[PDB]
């Protein structure tokens, strides 16, 4: 997703958008997998944000828009109860917050 | 199809109240943002909600009615003559029933002349002592005024936290049979017998005698009535609807008495310097509630509050 080239990134984003149709199978395989996909999308769009809008290249903005739309699709497909489950990651769990 | 519905977020978003600009903290100011979420877990929230509920939206007054017989100077006898039946002129009862309708104190949703049994939203001859304030009370209400007429009777054998309303206004009406007994009226001795319960509130009996004015009704032998009013002169002279030494027929007696009571109470409220309209009191109470119960959250922290379920806070 965070590849320097944008065409391969766009193809990867489309492939991720494809997986939304099999979220039931992903849940049956591993419980936390769809939440992991949503976290991956959130982190990627956060990382690409600082150098996206403060630039004169439209391709980065278009890729950001595509990332946001895929995130919206993933959120809509998932139920509300799953989205409210806390994020379980080592770096943040080390902190007392 | 979906089953559950969190309609609150739909309502906030559809009307345009919920937005990033609305939730943004004001710059260089202390007023809260345009949208604020309160808390139902901080102790005393429901008590303050009840405080806000008990505040009325329109001014209210109180009127006491007494009956006098010749050769009476003690408060006990004056209170006693009322509670008897068939021992007074029928014109007194006719004048009473022309002041307002009758409403039970328990089922009355408005002012009833006594704090402890007022604003209760949760629903053989005895004479004019029924209206003593324990079973029934004469009531009148308009779009801008509310009056509770109560006739005191002899006394025989924190749960309602009300914020200070302001200077209570009450006017007494006395039915005298002989004009010479007007001066011999024990107004001082009956101050303790006409406590409305607002004395504990209204914090913002000798000194209260001058505050209350008195209206005297003296029937004549020709059917007309003679009126004398004491202690109703202030900065703006006297009140017009019933001047001193006036004569009024029985047709326009109750209406003129009610108008005089309204004008006197309005003048008394306007004269005092520690009085504000009830909507100002409600606005100040709302501002105090906002200051003491607002939730300090950022914009992203507030959207996620809508999706989280409520009602299980004390159960989970």
């Amino acid at each position: 997703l965070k590849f320097p080239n944008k065409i391969v990134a766009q193809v990867a984003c489309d492939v991720l958008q494809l997986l939304v149709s099999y979220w039931e199978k992903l849940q049956m395989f591993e419980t936390s997998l769809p939440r992991k996909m949503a976290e991956i999308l959130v982190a990627t769009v956060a990382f690409l944000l600082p150098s996206a809008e403060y630039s004169s290249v439209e391709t980065d903005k278009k890729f950001i828009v595509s990332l946001l739309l895929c995130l919206l699709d993933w959120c809509m497909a998932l139920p509300v109860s799953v989205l409210l489950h806390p994020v379980s990651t080592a770096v943040l769990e080390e902190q007392h917050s | 199809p979906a089953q559950e519905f969190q309609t609150a977020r739909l309502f906030l978003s559809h009307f345009g109240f919920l937005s990033l600009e609305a939730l943004k903290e004001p710059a260089n100011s202390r007023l809260p943002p345009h949208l604020i979420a309160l808390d139902s877990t901080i102790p005393g929230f429901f008590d303050d909600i009840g405080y806000l509920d008990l505040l009325p939206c329109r001014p209210f007054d109180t009127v006491f009615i007494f009956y006098m017989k010749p050769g009476q100077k003690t408060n006990q006898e004056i209170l006693k003559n009322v509670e008897s039946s068939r021992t007074v002129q029928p014109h007194f009862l006719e004048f009473l029933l022309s002041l307002g309708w009758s409403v039970d104190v328990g089922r009355h949703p408005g002012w009833t002349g006594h704090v402890s049994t007022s604003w209760s939203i949760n629903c053989e001859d005895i004479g004019a002592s029924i209206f003593n304030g324990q079973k029934k009370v004469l009531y009148y209400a308009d779009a801008l005024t509310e009056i509770a007429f109560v006739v005191p009777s002899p006394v025989e054998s924190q749960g309602r936290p009300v914020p200070p309303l302001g200077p209570e206004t009450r006017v007494s009406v006395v039915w005298v049979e002989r004009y010479d007994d007007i001066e011999n009226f024990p107004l001082s001795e009956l101050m303790t017998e006409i406590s409305t319960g607002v004395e504990t509130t209204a914090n913002s009996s000798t000194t209260l005698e001058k505050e209350v004015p008195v209206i005297f009704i003296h029937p004549l032998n020709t059917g007309l009535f003679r009126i004398k009013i004491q202690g109703a002169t202030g900065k703006f002279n006297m009140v017009i609807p019933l001047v001193d030494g006036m004569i009024v027929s029985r047709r326009a007696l109750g209406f003129l008495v009610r108008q005089t009571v309204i004008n006197i109470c309005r003048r008394k409220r306007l004269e005092s310097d520690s009085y504000s309209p009830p909507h100002v009191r409600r606005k100040q109470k709302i501002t105090d509630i906002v200051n003491k119960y607002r939730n300090k959250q950022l914009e992203p922290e507030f959207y996620t509050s809508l999706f989280q379920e409520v009602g299980l806070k004390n159960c989970s």
Partner: protein, 85 residues
């Protein structure tokens, strides 16, 4: 809330000012709808159109129709004067 009772084919309410208007008997929008003496349009936060319309009293009212960038929605509301139960 996406799978509403009307099926996934319908997402935003299809109602408008012409519907349930006593002063206009037509089923399509027309200038007579604006000629109604009980219709008014407002702009809120410079990014929302709010339409207030007092329908004839159906019983078990105020009708609010809102148009924004997310679509259009309709609200039917009535006051509760008397006590309950």
């Amino acid at each position: 809330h996406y799978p509403l009772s009307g099926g996934p084919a319908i997402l935003h309410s299809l109602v408008s000012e012409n519907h349930d208007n006593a002063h206009v008997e037509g089923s399509e929008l027309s200038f007579e709808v604006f000629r109604s003496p009980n219709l008014q349009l407002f702009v809120f936060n410079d990014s929302t159109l709010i339409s207030y319309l007092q329908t004839p009293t159906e019983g078990p009212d105020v009708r609010v129709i809102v148009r924004d960038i997310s679509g259009k929605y309709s609200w039917d509301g009535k006051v509760l004067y008397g006590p309950l139960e």
